[PDB]
Amino acid sequence: TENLYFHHVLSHDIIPASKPIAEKLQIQPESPVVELKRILYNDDQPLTFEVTHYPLDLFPGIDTFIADGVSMHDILKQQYKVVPTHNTKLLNVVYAQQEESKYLDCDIGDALFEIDKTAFTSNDQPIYCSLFLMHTNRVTFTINS
Amino acid sequence: GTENLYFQHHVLSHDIIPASKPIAEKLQIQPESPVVELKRILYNDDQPLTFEVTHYPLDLFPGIDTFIADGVSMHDILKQQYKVVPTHNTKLLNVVYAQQEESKYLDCDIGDALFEIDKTAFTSNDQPIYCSLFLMHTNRVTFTIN
Question: What keywords were assigned to this record (chain B)?
Fold first, then answer.
């Protein structure tokens, strides 16, 4: 019972794209991507642990803009003239590993909602992908059809 | 994923019962109003995929229990018998934990994590018409929102 509809920067490293990342972003195997990890709190309780990847070949230098309090949507718009037009989201449950348990302050093995989101711009071009993890005791999702 | 429920059939039972507090609150009817409690299972193959419990207020849909049978589209009954079509719905998604009844119908263990989708359907004038709780084992489904 706290409703998500349907910011601390931990790290950002430039890494080669894994198979599933390269597949979602429609880019070459091992392409350079920025791996941005952020924790969203509400309140001093960790609410969402976010890992987003930006293809450096589309947004060259995008890592350099990253910092606490920075709106990446504003960076995309102001710096690269890109605004997302739609997104595709999948929702599953996955199970916390060492990293998630640290940042979400939970136990290894705890059930987490995983939202796997791919954002797109004009002509169905993927621009970034995000995986948001939330402890299942801490959130309810609202969907208004 | 697994099996894919996009966001945005055997009849187990139907009984006429008094509305609970939460059901009467959702349906905006008097406490203990008569409701039809329709329980159904939807199967993937032989695998139980959704255990549905839906409540229809008998005061809005008098005699609606008499239309209930395997294979019946309740949306069809509402439309032809009552001239009602839903115009929108609210849905909440949570995780809950199987008790004896769910464990039987969903063929899982007591205590297993289930997704619960809590749905209220509405017609013209924002009038609630029925409410549903769908339970699905967490290993067996992925939801898509696009």
Answer: DNA-binding, Transcription, Transcription regulation
Tokens of A122: 């004009």
A111-121 β-sheet, strand order: A8-16, A32-41, A46-55, A125-135, A111-121, A86-95, B141-145, B3-6
Range of the domain at B6: 1-146
Rg (CA), chain B: 15
Contact B142, A93 (CB under 8 A): no
Question: What sign does the dihedral A61-A64-A65-A67 (CA atoms) show?
Answer: positive
Question: What contacts 24+ positions apart, CB below 8 Å, involve A55-61?
Answer: A55/A17, A55/A25, A55/A27, A55/A31, A55/A127, A55/A128, A56/A14, A56/A31, A56/A32, A57/A27, A57/A31, A57/A32, A58/A127, A59/A34, A59/A127
Judged by phi (left if over 0) then psi (alpha if -120 to 50, else beta), residue B77 lies in alpha
Q: Give the nearest partner residue to B91 out of A93, A111, A143, using CB atoms.
A: A143
The residue of chain A with its CA nearest to that of B121 is: A145
Do the chains contact at B90 and A144, CB–CB below 8 Å?
A: yes
Listed in sequence order, the residues at least 6 apart from B98 whose beta carbon sits closer than 8 Å to its beta carbon are B106, B108, B109, B110, B111, B112, B113, B114, B135
Q: What is the distance between the alpha carbons of residues A41 and A68, in angstroms, rounded to a whole number?
A: 13
Contact at CB, A91 and B142, closer than 8 angstroms: yes
Chain B environment of A142 (Cβ under 8 Å): 90-92
| Minimum Cα–Cα distance from B143: chain A residue | A91
- What CA–CA distance (Å, rounded) separates B55 from B28? 12
Cα B17 from Cα B32, distance rounded (Å): 8
CATH number at residue A69: 3.40.1410.10
Number of domains in chain B: 1
DSSP one-letter code for A61 = T
